[PDB]
Write a protein that binds this ligand. Structure first.
Ligand SMILES: CC(=O)N[C@H]1[C@H](O[C@H]2[C@@H](O)[C@@H](CO)O[C@@H](O[C@H]3[C@H](O)[C@@H](O)[C@H](O)O[C@@H]3CO)[C@@H]2O)O[C@H](CO)[C@@H](O[C@@H]2O[C@H](CO)[C@H](O)[C@H](O)[C@H]2O)[C@@H]1O
Length: 147
């Protein structure tokens, strides 16, 4: 793995140091605290906050009731149609590994070595240069594998 960040402070906002061409991996290892209601990983076009940077891929584990993962895209401060995954591997008080693989037409996400979800590109992945990690989560490491 390349361009590793260890023990970043959350909220984390970081420049992705190369392009997300097909085959590129983003590998995030961390732990979910006991009081977590949600956290999110955002693949952003920049780091503007007003207007809020467009979010090509919002990957949003939620923990209330049975839990789920919500995926969506933010374009000019408007959320698109949510894509919900109900078979969620995340749990409070458990460590995890997220691997986001960039493919031509979509993201593929594996968590803890197991396929979790697909998310079709809504924004060109060439527009992505910024990794945001927010909410109730502890991140141990971030690393990339560029293709
Ligand atoms: C209130 C809140 O937590 N806001 C977050 C924001 O969350 C939204 C996002 O998860 C979308 C995805 O579709 O869903 C929003 O909730 C919807 C419900 O899911 C749905 O059932 C209901 O019908 O409609 C709801 C409203 O649309 C949810 O609020 O996520 C963004 C982007 O990650 C957060 O903004 C980012 O926050 C960080 C700090 O945590 C920084 O400030 C970033 O700059 C900022 O972009 C926002 O806090």
């Amino acid at each position: 793995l390349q361009n590793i960040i260890y023990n970043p402070v959350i909220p984390f906002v970081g420049t992705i140091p190369d392009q997300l061409d097909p085959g590129t991996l983003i590998v995030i290892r961390g732990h979910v605290p006991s009081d977590a209601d949600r956290f999110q990983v955002d693949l952003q076009n920049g780091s503007s906050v007003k207007p809020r940077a467009d979010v090509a891929f919002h990957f949003n584990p939620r923990f209330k009731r049975a839990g789920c993962i919500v995926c969506n895209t933010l374009i000019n401060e408007k959320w698109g149609r949510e894509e919900i995954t109900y078979d969620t591997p995340f749990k409070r008080e458990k460590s995890f590994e997220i691997v986001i693989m960039v493919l031509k037409d979509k993201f593929q996400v594996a968590v803890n070595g197991k396929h979790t979800l697909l998310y079709g590109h809504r924004i060109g992945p060439e527009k992505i240069d910024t990794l945001g990690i927010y909410g109730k989560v502890n991140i141990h490491s971030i690393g990339f594998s560029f293709s």
